[PDB]
Ligand binder design. Structure first.
Ligand SMILES: *[B]([O])([O])[C][N]C(=O)C1=[C][C]=[C][C]=C1Cl
Ligand SMILES: [Mg+2]
Ligand SMILES: [Mg+2]
Length: 466
């Protein structure tokens, strides 16, 4: 059974899809500590999203399962008989789940408090973190896309998945020969529009492209959309998330009967502010629940924001160098051995990240007996579960296998990088595993990953649901 398995796993790692890859593969029976399988466990590799495992663990250690995030609106002094204020401030403190709705509720409060006219200017204040929007080694050509959304303390998250710092672009065909309609969404009147796109003949080739040319706040739409085609939605990022938050707030305010007379822009609450009058606040859900969309779907924005929030908590510094040391620290404090870990971001988007599989599993261990173990394990995707908020990035993997509904694991993926790491809970004992592969040249080796996970479910004592 023990030896049978090792031979099995060896055979699974023979796949011609792992030609020239290096693969870190480690299993450990968590109840005993018995090492069921080690290949290249000490090997350093790019984790892609498995980096989140470390990030998520630190944040629970540093902020607690109970931490929530706040956003305030502040005028220098309360409104009067006339219901007047000068300048106005939207202050963000790193809520990663702050919606356009949450903005509206705040506009209503601002109104119910007696503001009727903002005589001066409206300022977006994201100074709780620094203004370093991107990690050095993140790639410019990735910048238009959601997962490479700019980082701020004030960022409007779109939808139930809480994608920060984007806008939904909806392109809709017209008649053949006419420009397609482009609807920028939230960023209407914020981001510039460059619509060059056209409506091709019925059943012609869909070739429409949506992009934000580097260094601009402009959405460039090119190509041709079929007259019979269903409208295309895309999540494209914008320049300066806080400014967009600022923009949508002037809209929220006017829609709650509050006239902004001036200009929207970035700016922090001035130092010469004696005793700021907070005119509306909002509080996020607790870190325990934010974890779900974060880990289930692999929100890069969330991981980074959580890094800077650790920097704030440990050093009063909403910063990358700060928060990342905070992560190594908290991980050590947990009993993790962080020698082979190189930390460059919280999301794992950076090719500067390195981890080993011994380290990953080491972490799986400590995490499993932390006071916050349940809320941590709840956050992971569950093999083959059809509910997006449960199956997460595993929803359409491993369906109808022994792994289904039992294996809890985080995935990770980019060019030449795939990883799966997590638990196999058994009527035997609860297993922990890490599989991390680099340098494969073909399609991401998901079959291999799945086969191993499925074997470990079977060794754990499970059968495929029929
Ligand atoms: B995890 O594997 O999702 C981290 N990686 C990414 O999110 C990613 C990296 C490079 C290109 C696209 C994506 Cl989604
Ligand atoms: Mg607008
Ligand atoms: Mg099962």
């Amino acid at each position: 059974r023990l030896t049978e398995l090792r031979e099995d796993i060896d055979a699974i790692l023979e796949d011609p899809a792992l030609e020239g890859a290096v693969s870190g593969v480690v299993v450990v029976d968590t109840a005993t500590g018995e090492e069921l399988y080690s290949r290249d466990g000490g090997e350093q590799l790019l984790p892609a999203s498995n980096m989140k495992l470390f990030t998520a663990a630190a944040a629970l250690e540093v902020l607690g399962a109970d931490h929530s995030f706040g956003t305030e609106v502040a005028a220098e002094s309360a409104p009067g008989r006339r219901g007047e204020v000068q300048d106005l401030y939207l202050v963000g403190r790193g809520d990663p789940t702050l919606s356009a709705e949450d903005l509206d509720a705040m506009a209503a409060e601002v109104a119910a408090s007696g503001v009727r006219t903002v005589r001066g200017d409206l300022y977006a204040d994201d100074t709780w973190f620094d203004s370093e929007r991107l990690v050095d080694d993140w790639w410019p050509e990735d910048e238009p896309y959601a997962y490479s959304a700019q980082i701020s303390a004030l960022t409007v998250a779109h939808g139930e998945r809480f994608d920060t710092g984007v806008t939904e672009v909806s392109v809709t065909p017209a008649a053949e020969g006419e420009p397609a309609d482009v609807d920028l969404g939230a960023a209407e009147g914020y981001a510039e529009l460059d619509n060059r796109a056209v409506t091709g003949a019925a059943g012609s080739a869909n070739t429409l492209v949506i992009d934000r040319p580097v260094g601009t706040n402009t959405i460039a739409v090119t190509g041709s959309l079929p007259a019979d085609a269903a409208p295309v939605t895309a999540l494209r990022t914008v320049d300066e998330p806080a400014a967009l938050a600022g923009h949508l707030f002037e809209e929220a305010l006017e829609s709650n009967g509050v006239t902004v007379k001036g200009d929207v822009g970035l700016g922090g609450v001035p130092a010469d502010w004696q005793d700021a009058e907070v005119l509306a606040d909002h509080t996020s859900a607790e870190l325990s629940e934010i974890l779900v969309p974060f880990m289930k779907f692999s929100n890069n924005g969330h991981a980074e924001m959580l890094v800077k929030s650790i920097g704030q908590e440990t050093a009063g510094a909403g910063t990358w160098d700060a928060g990342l040391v905070g992560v190594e620290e908290a991980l050590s404090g947990l009993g993790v051995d962080t020698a082979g870990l190189v930390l460059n971001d919280g999301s794992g988007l950076s090719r500067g990240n390195l981890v080993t599989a011994d380290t990953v599993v080491d972490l799986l261990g400590q995490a499993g007996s932390a006071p916050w173990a349940q809320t941590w394990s709840a956050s992971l995707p569950v093999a083959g579960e059809s509910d997006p908020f449960v199956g997460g990035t595993l929803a359409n993997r491993m369906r109808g296998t022994a792994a289904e509904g039992v294996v809890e694991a985080k995935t990770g993926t980019m060019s030449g990088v795939s990883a799966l790491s997590g638990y196999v809970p058994g009527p035997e004992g609860e297993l922990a595993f890490s599989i991390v592969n680099n340098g494969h040249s073909g399609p991401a080796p998901l079959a291999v990953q799945d086969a191993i996970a499925v074997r470990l479910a079977e060794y754990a004592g499970h059968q495929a649901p029929e």
